[PDB]
Design a protein around this nucleic acid. Sequence first.
RNA 1: UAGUGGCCUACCAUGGUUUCAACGGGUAACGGGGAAUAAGGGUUCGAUUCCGGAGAGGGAGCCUGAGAAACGGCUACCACAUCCAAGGAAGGCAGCAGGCGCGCAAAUUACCCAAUCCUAAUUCAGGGAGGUAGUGACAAUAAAUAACGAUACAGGGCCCAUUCGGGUCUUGUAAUUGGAAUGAGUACAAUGUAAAUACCUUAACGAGGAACAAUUGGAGGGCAAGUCUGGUGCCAGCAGCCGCGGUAAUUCCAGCUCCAAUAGCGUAUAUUAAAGUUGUUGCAGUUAAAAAGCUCGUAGUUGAACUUUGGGCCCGGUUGGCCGGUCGGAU
Lengths: 59, 185, 144, 134, 260
Amino acid sequence: AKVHGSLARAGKVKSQTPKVEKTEKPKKPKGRAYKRLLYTRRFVNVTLVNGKRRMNPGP
Amino acid sequence: PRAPRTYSKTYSTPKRPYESSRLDAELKLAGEFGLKNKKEIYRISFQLSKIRRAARDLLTRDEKDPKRLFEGNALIRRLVRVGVLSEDKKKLDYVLALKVEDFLERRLQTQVYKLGLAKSVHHARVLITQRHIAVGKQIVNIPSFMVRLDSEKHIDFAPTSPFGGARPGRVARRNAARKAEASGE
Amino acid sequence: GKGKPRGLNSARKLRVHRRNNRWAENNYKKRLLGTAFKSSPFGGSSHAKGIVLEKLGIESKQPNSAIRKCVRVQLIKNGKKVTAFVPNDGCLNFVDENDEVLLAGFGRKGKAKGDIPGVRFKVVKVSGVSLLALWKEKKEKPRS
Amino acid sequence: SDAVTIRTRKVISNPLLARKQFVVDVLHPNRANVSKDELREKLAEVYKAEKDAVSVFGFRTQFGGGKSVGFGLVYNSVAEAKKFEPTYRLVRYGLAEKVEKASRQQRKQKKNRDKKIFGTGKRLAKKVARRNAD
Amino acid sequence: ARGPKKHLKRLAAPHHWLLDKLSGCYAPRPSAGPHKLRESLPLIVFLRNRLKYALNGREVKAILMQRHVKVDGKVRTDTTYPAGFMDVITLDATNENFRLVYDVKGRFAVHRITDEEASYKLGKVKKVQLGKKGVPYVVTHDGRTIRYPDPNIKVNDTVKIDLASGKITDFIKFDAGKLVYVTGGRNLGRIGTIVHKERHDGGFDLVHIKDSLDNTFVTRLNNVFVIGEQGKPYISLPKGKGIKLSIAEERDRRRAQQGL
RNA sequence: UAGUGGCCUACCAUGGUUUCAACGGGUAACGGGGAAUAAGGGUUCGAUUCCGGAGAGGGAGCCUGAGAAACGGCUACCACAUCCAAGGAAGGCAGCAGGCGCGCAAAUUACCCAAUCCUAAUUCAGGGAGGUAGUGACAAUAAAUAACGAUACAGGGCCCAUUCGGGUCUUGUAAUUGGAAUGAGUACAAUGUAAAUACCUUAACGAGGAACAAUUGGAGGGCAAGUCUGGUGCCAGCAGCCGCGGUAAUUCCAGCUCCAAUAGCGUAUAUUAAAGUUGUUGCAGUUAAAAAGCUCGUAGUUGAACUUUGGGCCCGGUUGGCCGGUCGGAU
Ligand SMILES: [K+]
Ligand SMILES: [Mg+2]
Ligand SMILES: [Mg+2]
Ligand SMILES: [Mg+2]
Ligand SMILES: [Mg+2]
Ligand SMILES: [Mg+2]
Ligand SMILES: [Mg+2]
Ligand SMILES: [Mg+2]
Ligand SMILES: [Mg+2]
Ligand SMILES: [Mg+2]
Ligand SMILES: [Mg+2]
């Protein structure tokens, strides 16, 4: 209805972010290797179930 | 204005994409057999589906029917040949009750591992793509290759390549050269 | 009986009855009248280029509160004036006036999305570059 | 260079074109490729001919090395091979030689200019002398 | 489309020539000649595809212009000459004589014959009527006009032909008990004895045909071709002899050959 | 007229089609083989590789010829456009390539008759038919991006069970160290080809993780994966839908971590299934949408029962037999 709203704040919060940079961490494998990595984590070693498996558990 | 060259999709994606029970059971198979993708599992589900469809369409027809007798035996022998279907089961009924792992167990990758040779499915994929293992005479660098039961004895390392015979590789021929020139003047 | 003719020689009635009742379906009626061509800004095409005339700050619908950033566009093919949403944070900065935009649909078969009143389209590209690419900062917005 | 070997399969006697035609299987372990000018002479030995009568073509190597199947044929005489073989095959052996054509565009272009010119074009070229000044 | 078509696309070819789909785009269009287009086999197909003598359509012309090959005792220089059923292809070099005859799948066989047999061919008589100056003639299936025939000869009878002369040596009446070659349909290439003929005025006559293993079948009279008496073929038949085995029975006869 | 026929002319009759939908209008309609989706039944698509038709800016006319109402033939008119010394002349890419325009929307003004076949007076000539390469993430197939040691370092299997834990059988994690394996690439030379190019083959050369470095989308629910950290404070923004955001944001912008599919993944529009939400199979109609105010009635659809039934014979068939006897087939 009101089409004449202020356009001034456009791009506020993207401009207001502190530009933290990505950590140069070691690269994970690709292809069949990564599917092996997933299988070891998910099934073989057995993650610490608190009733059920998590994935991405908190501290 | 050539003839059309035909082609076909070899797989089928599942209907509901985030079923947890499936996703677990799929990664079980990608682990056990050392498969790259879910697409490799989907490939075998699709081949099983065409087989099961074929058998269902014959079991509707009466026993002692030409098309049943002919194609039924042809389907059975074709499975028996690749060693998916065992020698005891040759009814047609038994080809219906036939799981996905019963195809996976006969591909090269696993059949290399199961005959010694590697020590792991993950090693076997390497050996195959690295052109080491060879079926009877010639090299096969396709892990998908379904071994045909009259070829399983004849699997060995190639006449070309190390392990089997021949020159001792690329890295060895550099690593032999560096130690040799260091020792000599 | 079940209120429909069952007779062996009743195929005519069954076929004709079903034809008449298919006009009650939404998709069928649109497909046969040819609404997509006749009305419909894009003329039954997935996308359309247009020229930005304006920048609009459309107040959102309730119970949300926001000024959603939009552009009044005139399409090259028809001359049909249309409002399009400019998605992602601070992407209205990239557009400017008299800049050629490629519009797309919003996802809802010509219905308005979310809380944005009267907006059935979105910007995809400005002056031949992707709004995604400009906002991830891969390409640069050209001189004109 | 071990073994080398050569073997002709599916040998048809062909009186019509006056040749023996056959599939040239080539069990070559621990090599890369026998050349065409190499198969010919080895086959000229077995079939008792000169190299100019022998022909060989279409040698696809096997995957993973070893064999290299192809197709070979041996005519009765040289004169018989010269008439029946295609020119392109003879050039590879070095019996015929490449006649130097122009490009197709030029031959075509030339033909279209000549379509304009009726007759031999002697009296036309005479009027060109008095075209600059009538 | 304005006038007659000079090409034929590879897919629109007769299936029974067994042309490969990829290598090409056109196929050899039979010239006008004795046999119908779809019922013929061009020489280029016979030489290149079936006997494997030529490798290209250039080599087929190289062979034809030497003046070796001759169809019914006369030399031909046309790559797409429409040779057909009962024709005798004679090569001078090799001294191989063949007769084109259908195997059971419904395709022309490589059927080598002796030089004696190559003297003649059979000819199904198509029409028999009175020509100019009252001279009667017959018309064979390969379109040969033959004048002054035996008045016993009626339509659908076969007629033995001398080739060199091109005269009626002998003929076979169409009746019950005669051996037959079926020259079209689902049962193209089968051989068998006539049982009875169904009439149907202003329509299509049908011919019930038993064979040696007691399998009846019906064809149209247009597809039938008399080739002798019961167990007395005038020509030599190919391997099989127009039997038609099941796909099962065929697969069992492979397992005999599989032993080696 | 090649020939049948209102095909046309003369004369005569008054017929011909239609609610079993004529006639008219629309079609973002060339038809078919087919394609997509597919429990069964269906629904949607088919400009497009084969077959048939029509057209060559729009109309009409016509010469030649067996064959054309031909357009890489002519003639005229209409529209558009080219050169001119202004008197005149020459035009037709819905062939190949290419350009402009149009637009969401699509390639080189390349090489060749070697293959496929076609034409001619014709083994030779010609062929942008056609083939070969270039461009090409349309779609489809296969399928790298690591593998294996040994100390290592958390343990978990069972056996010393002394409370020392023997590293017992091995499984993970360390920016810890080992020798191997390799085509991606570059490149002898062959092979390949009309000539190449590329595969295929192959000398020589070519992985140490900082490199030869996988992405695209998500992480409240639907839906697989975090009430972890920093920012903003109903703003910016997200959100197919439900909903988030007004100072601890599980949802926004980011970092970390994790999920999913992966050389692909997302978005838009259309379409199929899901849809028994088009219902023949197979829906619903008291009150959710919907039984005509009532009856008559033509087409349509539908329409009770009844007419040689039973009995006695006889002859060949096809499977299991019963002794399949050698675990397979025989009478
Ligand atoms: K979840
Ligand atoms: Mg045409
Ligand atoms: Mg149209
Ligand atoms: Mg079409
Ligand atoms: Mg159109
Ligand atoms: Mg035009
Ligand atoms: Mg025309
Ligand atoms: Mg015209
Ligand atoms: Mg033109
Ligand atoms: Mg033309
Ligand atoms: Mg309902």
